[PDB]
Design an enzyme around this catalytic site. Structure first.
Site, short mmCIF file in Angstrom:
data_model
loop_
_atom_site.label_atom_id
_atom_site.label_comp_id
_atom_site.label_asym_id
_atom_site.label_seq_id
_atom_site.Cartn_x
_atom_site.Cartn_y
_atom_site.Cartn_z
N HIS A 1 -80.50 145.63 -27.14
CA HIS A 1 -81.72 145.98 -27.92
C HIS A 1 -83.13 145.42 -27.55
O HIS A 1 -83.82 144.87 -28.28
CB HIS A 1 -81.56 145.65 -29.44
CG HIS A 1 -80.39 146.33 -30.06
ND1 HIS A 1 -79.74 145.98 -31.28
CD2 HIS A 1 -79.66 147.48 -29.56
CE1 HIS A 1 -78.69 146.63 -31.60
NE2 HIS A 1 -78.65 147.64 -30.51
C1 LIG Z 1 -74.18 149.32 -24.04
C2 LIG Z 1 -75.28 149.83 -25.21
C3 LIG Z 1 -74.94 149.36 -26.52
C4 LIG Z 1 -75.89 149.77 -27.52
N1 LIG Z 1 -75.72 149.82 -28.74
C5 LIG Z 1 -76.48 150.68 -29.71
C6 LIG Z 1 -75.91 151.04 -31.07
O1 LIG Z 1 -75.05 150.76 -31.49
N2 LIG Z 1 -76.77 151.69 -31.91
C7 LIG Z 1 -77.97 152.10 -31.32
O2 LIG Z 1 -78.84 152.68 -32.13
N3 LIG Z 1 -78.66 151.65 -30.24
C8 LIG Z 1 -77.80 151.07 -29.15
N4 LIG Z 1 -78.38 150.73 -27.94
C9 LIG Z 1 -79.63 150.46 -27.78
C10 LIG Z 1 -80.50 151.76 -27.52
O3 LIG Z 1 -79.58 152.51 -26.83
C11 LIG Z 1 -81.75 151.32 -26.69
O4 LIG Z 1 -82.45 150.21 -27.14
C12 LIG Z 1 -82.54 152.48 -26.15
O5 LIG Z 1 -81.65 153.11 -25.00
C13 LIG Z 1 -83.93 152.07 -25.97
O6 LIG Z 1 -84.64 153.26 -25.28
P1 LIG Z 1 -85.57 153.11 -23.82
O7 LIG Z 1 -86.10 154.53 -23.57
O8 LIG Z 1 -86.77 152.24 -24.33
O9 LIG Z 1 -84.70 152.29 -22.77
P2 LIG Z 1 -83.32 153.06 -22.11
O10 LIG Z 1 -82.49 153.88 -23.23
O11 LIG Z 1 -82.64 151.86 -21.47
O12 LIG Z 1 -83.56 153.95 -20.96
C14 LIG Z 1 -84.37 153.73 -19.68
C15 LIG Z 1 -84.05 154.76 -18.65
O13 LIG Z 1 -84.81 154.37 -17.49
C16 LIG Z 1 -84.26 154.40 -16.23
N5 LIG Z 1 -84.83 153.49 -15.37
C17 LIG Z 1 -85.10 152.36 -15.52
N6 LIG Z 1 -85.83 151.84 -14.40
C18 LIG Z 1 -86.29 152.82 -13.55
C19 LIG Z 1 -86.84 152.99 -12.28
N7 LIG Z 1 -87.49 151.89 -11.66
N8 LIG Z 1 -86.90 154.43 -11.64
C20 LIG Z 1 -86.32 155.21 -12.47
N9 LIG Z 1 -85.67 155.31 -13.67
C21 LIG Z 1 -85.47 154.08 -14.22
C22 LIG Z 1 -82.73 154.19 -16.61
O14 LIG Z 1 -81.66 154.88 -15.78
C23 LIG Z 1 -82.77 154.70 -18.14
O15 LIG Z 1 -82.03 155.84 -18.03
C24 LIG Z 1 -77.41 150.29 -26.95
C25 LIG Z 1 -77.43 150.24 -25.78
C26 LIG Z 1 -76.60 150.22 -24.60
C27 LIG Z 1 -76.91 150.47 -23.29
#
Ligand SMILES: Cc1cc2nc3c(=O)[nH]c(=O)nc-3n(C[C@H](O)[C@H](O)[C@H](O)COP(=O)(O)OP(=O)(O)OC[C@H]3O[C@@H](n4cnc5c(N)ncnc54)[C@H](O)[C@@H]3O)c2cc1C
Ligand SMILES: Cc1cc2nc3c(=O)[nH]c(=O)nc-3n(C[C@H](O)[C@H](O)[C@H](O)COP(=O)(O)OP(=O)(O)OC[C@H]3O[C@@H](n4cnc5c(N)ncnc54)[C@H](O)[C@@H]3O)c2cc1C
Ligand SMILES: Cc1cc2nc3c(=O)[nH]c(=O)nc-3n(C[C@H](O)[C@H](O)[C@H](O)COP(=O)(O)OP(=O)(O)OC[C@H]3O[C@@H](n4cnc5c(N)ncnc54)[C@H](O)[C@@H]3O)c2cc1C
Lengths: 636, 642, 93, 93
Positions: free
Chosen positions: B558
């Site tokens: 998170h």
């Molecule tokens: C194993 C796990 C368990 C979790 N458990 C829960 C849960 O029980 N309930 C819940 O609601 N949420 C859960 N989450 C939390 C939630 O999924 C994240 O907080 C959410 O994904 C945040 O969104 P985001 O867009 O900010 O980042 P992210 O979801 O992490 O997405 C970022 C994306 O950017 C890409 N990326 C990163 N750097 C680069 C780069 N330099 N070039 C190109 N692409 C890049 C990555 O491939 C990724 O697909 C969990 C996450 C994980 C991984």
């Protein structure tokens, strides 16, 4: 029935388009489709995409294919006799093929040099036939046609592995390589499979069976070999004579049934089937007919000449045991086969068997740099044919997630093969009948490699496709046995399975890692960090690839050009409307008519030709084609 | 093509919202989504819920995660180097996460102290995204959104077992603990699963593949690691440079392809990937960019700072053999996997695999009585942060119906684990790049437990979740091996498996009931008529628990706050509309922007950030966001229904 | 006096048991917000007024598992009606 | 300490069972190292759980190497105390 309006001979895709479109334009129009092979309607060995591989077995059981063998041995293929098979079922190629969705480039059609066969002229007809069920970033594809297209139920993890690898050697990703425009690029590869039903997009169910369900004007005679076209005093086509598939009559004695056409006689029996029908009808080379004692109707020497094909090479690589591939399924491991058949029945929309597992690939084109490394004779063909034609690819390359190869000659473990073919060969062949009899084999000659320009590009591909395989995650080695006979100390020589992968295969086996015999050079075990550099090749290595090409090159079943559409004085056989020169009411509409090759898997091509032939017979009989077509069985 | 209107860098939740909304808002607006990970479209290792657990295996095969290790050993974790993973696949977290449906409390959003981001300002956007498919006694949720929320196909018997025990210790039941208002209560815990199709509700298929199915103006490029952002002489974003996923060209040698943006560049690469992109692009700590030979675009020292998370602990307990758990499925017992895979295929709407098996939990908050025992440094935090903020929970607690632990380190038998996390930690970390090169690992620091305030609540939680475990029907003992190292003579010491339960595991076993070793003290066999009293702990037992926390506290995936939305002079990276200070036509919309923590599993929050970004970008391009969104693949044709 | 093929509380189409909770309660709870369900709660006694009016209800856990065995009654009040549907055995008690 | 040094030098040795050994400080060079990753994956090849760090319950051993040079575990006064307690806890008839 003894008499009808139209008679379509051979139920290939082109024939199926023609028979179906016309019967549906005008319910008065009594049309009969005659097919040498069996009816494919609701055959689970036709409509399930994942069993396609079985259709090329020479096991004296399978009969959805006829096998043509070169009459003589070819010097150019180091003394072997090429085997070109073709379909022997309703739907023809569409019932048994690899179900790879590919389209030719715009210039391919333009280069027919015929009014009505410009890309422009055919593009609306291209869209008419397609039901496109996948995303893309263009407006090139149809969305209400009979033939459904998709990425199938489940793409295999090796697909995006291959792309990651292609990218790393400078082939760019694209949403759509089938946009008539792309010659150097790599996509996820689509299939003639309905996204929703998981069934094969065969021409017969789409065009013919759809119609026959809702009208009574479309007649179907399967298991019936068209012998000859019956002619009028003025060379008008009056009917057709057919015999049974099997020659199982009392005393092997010939039995012809006759069926007369009021308006039109169409030939769609294929590049190999069509010319034969013309020649024993008395339409072909005047001399050949004289000697076989067939009365000449029209002297067309180019009937059965200019046999073109795409030239396949199969590069096999070993992969990890945690990889997902078709190999155990292809071997007959009952509970692998039971798990996949069952999965298809319960949920076809996501089943592994709702696929051909040829899930990615590229069309490619050589750089200036690379051209130099090729021959004088290919650089000549390069200037004459490709230089100012930049929308033409030189080679096609795809990944099969499994070993398209006799597993009876393969060690255990998992494989992927690099399926490669030559998009436009310079090399040329021919086919001619040997008798008035329709049961006898014709004289045949693939013509593969009789033009020396055809080697360099294929050699170039082997090298290129190898560099992809080596850069994959799944890669655990080259299958030495099925690779070119490199000198063992040559830096280009094969490295086979590593020890850690081999132990995994037989973990209680007494023999794994016994060096005795020095039969292979093991790879070093997989490193995710391994820096990689191109294999260098010497002149000796290149010779070893050339010889490997001569030894292991095959048809791609993309046969065309044996009743060609060009002026008669250039050895042509048909009009710009596909009328046979020197006759009345006789047309070839199949891939035989093509004056030149198409940078594509030719199911798309055969359908389009069919759609075009349907237009040409529709305006000649003052019919109007209906859009959409009859609803296809089992479709949503 | 080489030129489009909007580029979105990273296809997590937020980036899928932004890319999707904008493409659907105007078919003429050509937008490209670039994702380092692989396409997740119609992959049975994404769309089936119950296999989520595999996505965190460092086993050589799995490439759906990238794993960030602390550069240096933390003394605060008694020497260990902390591991934080995050997604490496389209849909980001949403393609691989636990799928627990949680929402932040109202006060969390207010406390951003940024106009446009009040609870009241966001509530409509909160509803906009949800397709709520479970009963509740309030009007807080949405019913026409792309993202399906449900109780899934089957709730595990332990869910209600867990609830009865929670009630037994004075945590009250509720219909909805995600009503923005609750800090102290226990629920059946919902999932990001569609009730009907039995499929994981991933952001990608909801917002991206939906649009790609019916329009040509959204371009997807997966397996493309965004190196950096290309800049004007006036610091306007002009475009973006990306390299292959795998560093596998001729000689491990860099091959950038460039794509240009006419109107907008959005970074949505998450809390750990966004700061990295900014830093190597020229935005970040000037001293850090000088040393790495990067030309400065904007000196923002906050880029990569104030890294925040939730801090998980995992108390494992042994349970009865007749209890239903995921343990034998997770071990890869053949015919158990065959049965659950088959069940999912034939009837997704009732399948065990149409669940994450985290079927009950609570948000909790300590009493005045309990606050006295929690020490001086938490009581400082309490008075300053929680005291007059009564809708903010202190700890989270939930039950998994199976051990979430390497089963190669667990005895045989069935388990349940009490999955806990600290909701608003005081501890902080950072993350900075160590090179221009996009393949070299960054410098990293979790920061876990560097503020001594975070021990007391995690300790408190352990005792509390234990009292719940001890009062269940299924409870057959604590897994000594995975619990704190109490004195063996301490009353607070563990009691492992029952002789009865043990004889059922291995009925032909020769070793069952051999005392020799005294490796465990066996629990007395289950009695339904048992009277149960709190474990009394001592100051020495407390130390043991702190030790246990230092050794086994972990991430909760998170991650947020590395690009904080606050004034530049405070150390902010973005203004109130998510523009990056110092630049033009560049926005950060993902969880990196949060200036403070949210008391929630953060997929909800990421989508909300996503939606709010989509809004902000739409009113700057004079676009109207269409409702409802494009229809989601495989979903049924959609106000509250059954 | 007569013999038949004997019918069941089962839906012919879905194969499911025609239980009353799903038919009357879960149906409603799915479409409206005014029906509250508290399971695993055993009613002790109906609270009364001075005028012997029903005002509310005291419920305890299903499991008797507090610290000293100490009874933990929670109270939920009633503006209009208390209904007793705890069955032949439950109601009287 | 002596029987340990024998264990480490055996070809078959793949790690100490952390659960059943003295309670060393984790950062102590005398701490246990439990099963290595390649051996773990062989036990449960189809398992979803193998190689999940989460919980940090064990420092995994390094994969086996026949050519490994081996040196003795150094022990401090504190390690000696861990073993003394381990003996107190686990010595038997
Ligand atoms: C194993 C796990 C368990 C979790 N458990 C829960 C849960 O029980 N309930 C819940 O609601 N949420 C859960 N989450 C939390 C939630 O999924 C994240 O907080 C959410 O994904 C945040 O969104 P985001 O867009 O900010 O980042 P992210 O979801 O992490 O997405 C970022 C994306 O950017 C890409 N990326 C990163 N750097 C680069 C780069 N330099 N070039 C190109 N692409 C890049 C990555 O491939 C990724 O697909 C969990 C996450 C994980 C991984
Ligand atoms: C194994 C295989 C793999 C292939 N791979 C691909 C691929 O991956 N992708 C792709 O797009 N395309 C593929 N094709 C190519 C494509 O299917 C053919 O190019 C196309 O089907 C040719 O259509 P046609 O109408 O010209 O003739 P055909 O498809 O060959 O059909 C001719 C029909 O006429 C019948 N016939 C022959 N002689 C007579 C006679 N005397 N009387 C009556 N009937 C007769 C035959 O029984 C047959 O049914 C492949 C084909 C095969 C067989
Ligand atoms: C095993 C069995 C077989 C039967 N066979 C048939 C059959 O074949 N066909 C048929 O038509 N009928 C059958 N019946 C009869 C029928 O189900 C009952 O007579 C009918 O359900 C009575 O309904 P009720 O409202 O009186 O109370 P009940 O059905 O008894 O339900 C009352 C509810 O009140 C709850 N309760 C009790 N005390 C308290 C308290 N202090 N606080 C809170 N809640 C409390 C109980 O948990 C129970 O759920 C059967 C019943 C049973 C149990």
């Amino acid at each position: 029935p003894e008499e009808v309006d139209v008679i379509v001979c051979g139920g290939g895709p082109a024939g199926c388009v023609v028979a179906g479109r016309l019967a549906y334009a005008d319910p008065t129009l009594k049309v009969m489709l005659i097919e040498g092979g069996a009816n494919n309607r609701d055959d689970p060995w036709v409509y399930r995409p994942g069993i396609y591989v079985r259709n090329m077995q020479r096991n004296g059981i399978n009969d959805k294919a006829t096998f043509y063998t070169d009459t003589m041995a070819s010097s150019y293929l180091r003394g072997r006799r090429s085997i070109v098979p073709c379909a022997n079922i309703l739907g023809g190629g569409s019932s048994i093929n690899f179900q790879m969705y590919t389209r030719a480039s715009a210039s391919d059609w333009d280069d027919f040099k015929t009014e009505g066969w410009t890309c422009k002229d055919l593009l609306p007809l291209m869209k008419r036939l397609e039901n496109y069920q996948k995303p893309c970033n263009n407006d090139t594809h149809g969305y209400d046609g009979p033939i459904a297209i998709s990425n199938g139920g489940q793409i295999m993890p090796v697909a995006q592995d291959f792309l990651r690898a292609a990218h790393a050697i400078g082939v760019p990703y694209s949403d759509d390589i089938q946009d008539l425009t792309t010659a150097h690029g790599a996509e996820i590869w689509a299939k003639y499979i309905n996204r929703h039903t998981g069934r094969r997009s065969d021409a017969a169910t789409a065009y013919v069976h759809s119609v026959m369900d809702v009208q009574d004007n479309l007649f179907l005679r399967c298991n019936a070999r068209v012998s000859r076209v019956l002619f009028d005093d003025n060379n008008k086509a009056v009917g057709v004579a057919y015999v049974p598939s099997r020659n199982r009559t009392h005393g092997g004695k010939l039995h012809e049934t006759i069926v007369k056409a009021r308006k039109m006689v169409v030939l769609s029996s294929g590049t190999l089937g069509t010319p034969q029908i013309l020649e024993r009808s008395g339409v072909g080379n005047g001399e050949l007919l004289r000697q076989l004692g067939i009365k000449i109707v029209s002297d067309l020497p180019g009937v059965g000449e200019q046999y073109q094909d795409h030239y396949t090479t199969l590069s096999i690589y070993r992969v990890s045991n945690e990889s997902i591939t078709t190999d155990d399924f292809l071997r007959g491991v009952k509970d692998v086969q039971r798990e996949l058949f069952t999965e298809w029945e319960v949920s076809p929309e996501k089943a592994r068997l709702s696929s051909n597992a040829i899930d990615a690939g590229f069309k490619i084109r050589p750089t200036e740099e690379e051209l130099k490394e090729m021959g004088p004779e290919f650089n000549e063909l390069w200037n004459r044919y490709f230089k100012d034609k930049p929308d033409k690819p030189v080679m096609f390359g795809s990944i099969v997630a499994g070993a398209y190869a006799d597993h009876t000659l393969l060690p255990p473990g998992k494989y992927i093969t690099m399926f490669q073919y030559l998009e436009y060969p310079a090399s040329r062949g021919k086919i001619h009948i040997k008798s008035q009899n329709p049961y006898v084999e014709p004289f045949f000659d693939s013509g593969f490699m009789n033009n020396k320009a055809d080697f360099a590009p294929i050699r170039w591909s082997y090298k290129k496709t190898r560099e992809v395989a080596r850069r994959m995650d799944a890669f655990r080695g080259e299958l030495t046995s099925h690779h070119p006979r490199f000198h063992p100390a040559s830096p280009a020589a094969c490295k086979d399975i590593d020890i850690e992968t081999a132990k995994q295969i037989y973990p209680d086996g007494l023999t794994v890692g016994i060096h005795m015999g020095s039969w292979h050079q093991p790879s070093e075990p997989y490193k995710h960090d391994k820096v990689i550099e191109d294999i260098p090749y010497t002149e000796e290595d290149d010779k070893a690839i050339d010889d490997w090409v001569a030894d292991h090159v095959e048809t791609t079943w993309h046969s065309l050009g044996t009743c060609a559409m060009k002026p008669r004085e250039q050895g042509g056989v048909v009009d710009k409307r596909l009328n046979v020169y020197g006759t009345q009411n006789l047309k070839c509409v199949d891939l035989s008519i093509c004056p030149d090759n198409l940078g594509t898997n030719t199911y798309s091509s055969a359908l389009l030709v069919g759609e075009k032939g349907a237009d040409l017979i529709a305006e000649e009989l003052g019919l109007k084609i209906k859009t959409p077509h009859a609803p296809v069985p089992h479709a949503p």
